[PDB]
Design a protein around this ligand. Structure first.
Ligand SMILES: *[C@@H]1O[C@H](CO)[C@@H](O[C@@H]2O[C@H](CO)[C@H](O)[C@H](O)[C@H]2O)[C@H](O)[C@H]1NC(C)=O
Ligand SMILES: *[C@@H]1O[C@H](CO)[C@@H](O[C@@H]2O[C@H](CO)[C@H](O)[C@H](O)[C@H]2O)[C@H](O)[C@H]1NC(C)=O
Length: 130
């Protein structure tokens, strides 16, 4: 499913993402935009390490979810990676929250580092009423 920008912003606000561990909604929106284009079914396979990034937040099957085909998998979110391909993003959100409780926080996503960090991202939430 492809969220429209503001539709996603409000959805993330409802799911307690605004200010979760210091991260503003704009920062999460920026992350989602660049990782998946707001698409819940996006998947990017890394043939080098045999892992796949799943969903709207493009979370990794090596560390976070179990897809049963990734070596070294630890499933720290205790979720099936299929849960990250669902239209309902509560799942993907609970896991992204787990992910950000690591030493590096939101730096766990380098597209945030590349396209969001040290740039004004409030543009991602403008007009959404959040
Ligand atoms: C993307 O892959 C990263 C590794 O290349 C990963 O970062 C590692 O995550 C570990 C989680 O147990 C731990 O924090 C390591 O210190 C860290 O290098 C990162 O979490 C992955 N990002 C996503 C969104 O899956
Ligand atoms: C996704 O973001 C990850 C940031 O955590 C990044 O993994 C990092 O890779 C670094 C260099 O190997 C270092 O080991 C960090 O500890 C590790 O977390 C991963 O490469 C990113 N990948 C893409 C495609 O965005």
């Amino acid at each position: 499913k492809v969220f429209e920008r503001c539709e996603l912003a409000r959805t993330l606000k409802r799911l307690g993402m605004d200010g979760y561990r210091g991260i503003s909604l704009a920062n999460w929106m920026c992350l989602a935009k660049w990782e998946s284009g707001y698409n819940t079914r996006a998947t990017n396979y890394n043939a080098g390490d045999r892992s796949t990034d799943y969903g709207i937040f493009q979370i990794n099957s090596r560390y976070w979810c179990n897809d049963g085909k990734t070596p070294g998998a630890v499933n720290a979110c205790h979720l099936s990676c299929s849960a990250l391909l669902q239209d309902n993003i509560a799942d993907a959100v609970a896991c992204a929250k787990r992910v950000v409780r690591e030493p590096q926080g939101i730096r766990a996503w380098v597209a945030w580092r590349n396209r969001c960090q040290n740039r004004d991202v409030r543009q991602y939430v403008q007009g959404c009423g959040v």
